[PDB]
Amino acid sequence: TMMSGRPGRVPLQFLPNEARSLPPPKLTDPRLVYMGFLGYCSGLIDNAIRRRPVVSAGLHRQLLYVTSFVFFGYYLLKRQDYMYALRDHDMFAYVKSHPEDFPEKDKKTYGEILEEFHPVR
Amino acid sequence: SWDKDVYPEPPRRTPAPAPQTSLPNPVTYLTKIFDLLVDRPVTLAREFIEQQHAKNRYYYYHREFRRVPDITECEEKDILCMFEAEMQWRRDYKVDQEIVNIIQERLKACQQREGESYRQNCAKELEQFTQVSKAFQDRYSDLGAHYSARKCLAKQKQRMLAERKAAK
Numbered sequence A: 001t002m003m004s005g006r007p008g009r010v011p012l013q014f015l016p017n018e019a020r021s022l023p024p025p026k027l028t029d030p031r032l033v034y035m036g037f038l039g040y041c042s043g044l045i046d047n048a049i050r051r052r053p054v055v056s057a058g059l060h061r062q063l064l065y066v067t068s069f070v071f072f073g074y075y076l077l078k079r080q081d082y083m084y085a086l087r088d089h090d091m092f093a094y095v096k097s098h099p100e101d102f103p104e105k106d107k108k109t110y111g112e113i114l115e116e117f118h119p120v121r
Numbered sequence B: 001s002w003d004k005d006v007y008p009e010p011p012r013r014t015p016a017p018a019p020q021t022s023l024p025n026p027v028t029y030l031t032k033i034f035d036l037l038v039d040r041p042v043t044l045a046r047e048f049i050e051q052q053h054a055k056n057r058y059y060y061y062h063r064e065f066r067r068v069p070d071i072t073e074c075e076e077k078d079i080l081c082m083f084e085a086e087m088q089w090r091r092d093y094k095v096d097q098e099i100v101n102i103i104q105e106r107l108k109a110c111q112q113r114e115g116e117s118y119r120q121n122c123a124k125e126l127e128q129f130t131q132v133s134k135a136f137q138d139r140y141s142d143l144g145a146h147y148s149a150r151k152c153l154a155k156q157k158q159r160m161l162a163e164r165k166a167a168k
Helices: A018-022 A030-049 A059-097 B026-056 B079-120 B123-140 B150-168
Strands: none
Touching: A018 A059, A018 B123, A030 A059, B079 B150, B123 B150
């Protein structure tokens, strides 16, 4: 539904070449940092489940957790941004192509408009 | 240092002392004792502190806000102009509250100062406060807790339409 049938959509492609025009997610993005935090929590939970020292054991394993989560999060953020940008692109194009459906409205200042006053008594 | 025009005080008429009895007046001697024991030391202390203040004198300034377009000239959903105009309206609301406060202070000071003749000799201040209170009530009363420039504008429009209907 919605974007699934967008014309020109190559099947089973995570990131289309069109996305490269969009700015890449910054490596200091808060969302990516939160993904890394999720990876760290995953490592801590793994240590707890296996009854290892929670915060000191398996530093390589925790590093792998954080790196994998950040690595997938970067592409997930890129795809999310691409999809929202596609939505905005299509919305603006549709507004331009259908002027009647989205008519400009006369702007009336508050002096002209009459809004009834309901006294708080 | 308060302005006399903003805070009027009637000129002071103090009767001159006219003793008719030989007995010494206790109040006079007690007041002289007070002057010597208290007033002179207090005056000297304030002299010292004022000298110290004069040694390093620095100034503070009263901010001036330029008038900005009102809500009446702000288009619908124009949040920038609406924000500017609403902030101006709130500042004016505070200023009108302060004006009402000044008039009420005049009223109370007149009640105290006149004494037993307050009913007649305070009539002018009471009339001033009556006018100010009517104006303030008409402008801002009943707007509610969430008072806004738009609601005050709506109340003014309602009043003006009622006045036109009175014109018939």
